[PDB]
């Protein structure tokens, strides 16, 4: 759900009010009239954060994007603070489709192993980077380049795939998940990391997209897909 769809200013539901199709089309399911205004905007975080299409930094600290007014936004920052802002872009790497030389046999996928290089992301901010007497504890031990990405797996030539969203881990501290003395995510601090992502699905053809639509950086060094072969029992999507 990367779209913000409004009908005369009323927000529509991604699956109840419209349908996101595979051909660059939006299909309206509800009742509407002629002459109404349908606006489709890019909202990578869904209907919950419509301002998620751009990122704002205040003193090298990522902030929640405020609602722009007439192409302009305001911040409640202290005078003299350095502000960096820009527009997010969509980054996608697509693997070749794997069919095991068979167009009819099912392949049940079990796991995807992703080998990531994090040497560009293992750097942290130091106390000498403090500007205008900001909160030093918010900046220190903070990763200069955050590392995180999304993994989508699609089957049977269809684009309605299963997505694992944050595979590097949370960017904040969670109970029973975070570790002491290591900044979150703690999988980023390892210069070379191997992620085992369980992707359970059945199809004659499977394909992976490693994507991102935020200020986060990834560097895939390799991948491997584990699968088992079943019978030729494919019938269709409907």
């Amino acid at each position: 759900n990367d779209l913000y769809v409004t009908l005369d200013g009323t927000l529509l539901t991604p699956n109840v009010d419209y349908i996101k199709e595979e051909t660059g089309y939006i299909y309206l399911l509800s009742t509407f009239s002629t002459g109404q205004t349908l606006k489709i905007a890019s909202s990578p975080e869904g209907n919950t954060t419509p301002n998620s299409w751009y990122t704002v930094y205040v003193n090298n600290i990522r902030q929640v994007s405020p609602t722009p007014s007439a192409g302009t936004f305001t911040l409640g920052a202290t005078n003299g603070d350095i502000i960096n802002w820009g527009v997010n872009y969509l980054t996608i790497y697509t693997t070749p489709q794997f069919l095991w030389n068979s167009l009819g046999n099912f392949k049940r996928t079990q796991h995807a192993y992703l080998f990531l290089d994090n040497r560009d992301g293992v750097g942290v901010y130091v106390a000498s980077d403090v500007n205008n007497g900001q909160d030093i504890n918010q900046l220190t031990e903070l990763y200069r380049v955050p590392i995180n990405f999304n993994l989508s797996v699609m089957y049977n030539n269809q684009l309605d795939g299963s997505t694992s969203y944050d595979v590097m881990g949370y960017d904040s501290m969670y109970w029973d998940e975070g570790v002491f003395d290591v900044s979150s995510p703690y999988d980023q601090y390892q210069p070379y990391q191997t992620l085992k992502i369980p992707i359970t699905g059945i199809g004659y053809a499977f394909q992976m997209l490693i994507w991102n639509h935020s200020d986060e950086y990834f560097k895939l060094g390799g991948y491997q897909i584990i699968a088992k072969q079943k019978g030729k029992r494919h019938i269709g999507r409907y």
Binding site: I19, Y27, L29, Y238
Partner: protein, 53 residues
């Protein structure tokens, strides 16, 4: 029909009519197969209500 209520008096003139509920059988969604049985059932319910009225 089976009565399971309180004991009625002797020779109670019990009357049963038909009253088709005003409700939809099923909502068709995106990608749903066109069901001839569903169409016939909806038309039959409409006919039943009209005959009752």
């Amino acid at each position: 029909l089976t009565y399971t209520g309180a004991a009625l008096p002797s020779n109670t003139p019990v009357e049963i009519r038909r009253k088709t509920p005003n409700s939809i059988i099923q909502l068709v969604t995106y990608g749903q197969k066109l069901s001839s049985n569903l169409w016939n059932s909806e038309i039959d319910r409409n006919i039943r209500w009209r005959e009752e009225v």
